[model samples]
Target: LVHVASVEKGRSYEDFQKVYNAIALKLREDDEYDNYIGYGPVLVRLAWHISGTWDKHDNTGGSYGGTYRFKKEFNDPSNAGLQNGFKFLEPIHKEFPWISSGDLFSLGGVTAVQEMQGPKIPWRCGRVDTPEDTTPDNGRLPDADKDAGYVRTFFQRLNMNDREVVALMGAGALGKTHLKNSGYEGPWGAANNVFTNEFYLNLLNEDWKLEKNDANNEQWDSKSGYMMLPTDYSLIQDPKYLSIVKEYANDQDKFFKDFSKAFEKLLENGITFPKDAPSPFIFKTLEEQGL
Candidate 1:
């Protein structure tokens, strides 16, 4: 679906950068959410959930449409905890009313990443607002109580490979799971807001025991007070995923590089950028701006 860039009438990179700055500034200001983890994790997950719905074969439900703003999509059971991200972006959207919903939503993730010291995720703009009718039906996101086979198969719909899947899951290290939201709980590591390869490292090094959570679903519990979803543990259990996990765990730089590429690809899925669309922008962080 080569989407010719619908470049907003006179907008360009600088305009979008201003939007990025706003999001980054707010992220720094909103320091009390999620036990002081701030909005970064949820924003990252927001970007993922929005883009994760893409059905490559059919070219539907991706971040390109920005349909997550619709009631049905926003209220997805799979997106139970993302309201934090959405509410955070509301004020920015008001200030930048001309920006498309898709662009605001996707860019929030990009801004959150850079502001949180994550790898640079190059982002492009041109997503137009789509109608509520175009919003995908719920149940398109992946399940947590699944195995490696299911994880592999689930990402196939988004046209992601093992390396990409592993890189994305590495993001799990940045956020805690809420039992009320996903029937899961605990962080993958101690630093729940900083982006790192800790998820892969934890998966490879943690002492885990199979146990049932409050939801009666099986999860791996570690003595360190960390918890792993069935799918998180599957990376180490499966030979293929385990190899990539080891690679990421052993080399932080490699994980950051691969994750940047995979995250950019995830954000770009299903869009048809013009042949001459500007190269993706790598926005400067707030620290870089002395903010």
Candidate 2:
């Protein structure tokens, strides 16, 4: 995840600045959402989904090529609502037409995650663009309808083991999968905007019930008005997953540390960097930059 300093030979601070400007401007402009909550959640989800494709061993399918900008990749059914993120980035692309589509898309994911109070994901450059064929064959994202086994198998392809899988799912603690987007509804936790371990805590402690939703699909629900996808609930049911879930719930600091590491791994999957590459950059958030 180190940002190799002399990347692309001709690349410079100005180049990265242009890309950053494009990302910042679009984020400012495209703020509307399903009910005016803004595009934050789905944009974060977009970054997660794109990085989630990495398998590590083959070095194929990751945030590297930024292939998600292309229509073929955008058309991925699993990426259904991500068009909002793409549409959000279009003008940024138009304005800074020089940066490769790959870097911009991956960087967008980094920006979204960091701005949302999640981990400080390291990034890199030099992911060469491939033909439309290289965009994955689709159907790689997790299914909301399945149980623990299904979730485990799907994440294994991404090189995440059981503990990392549960920690990442705790991200669901931050946002909800809309019925309009995934045929499921309900927030995973109350603080759906800020990043925290409340999702894990809630999963273990909150009393939940299996209830049918407005869409006539059943998801686990709580009397306090929270909901969990069947896939989300399976974390607590499985003994292995439940153990990890409990660890996270008991320690917020450990959850943050683990989630940050796994997430940074997800974002940087598939790209190779030289040993001499410069250390990672930790850009200041808008708030930090304000002073």
For model 1, what is the error of residue 214's alpha carbon versus the real structure, in angstroms, after optimal superposition?
Answer: 1.5
lDDT of each: 0.89, 0.74
How far residue 291's Cα lies from its native spot in candidate 1, in Å, is 1.4
Clashing pairs in 1: 2-272, 3-272
Tens-digit per-residue lDDT, 46-83, candidate 1: 99999998998878889888899999999999999898
Tens-digit lDDT track of model 2 for 116-150: 67666666666556667677667667778889999
Off by over 4 Å in 1: none
TM-score of each: 0.98, 0.88
Question: Which model scores highest in lDDT?
Answer: 1
Which 10-residue window of candidate 2 scores lowest in summed lDDT? 1-10
TM-score of 1: 0.98
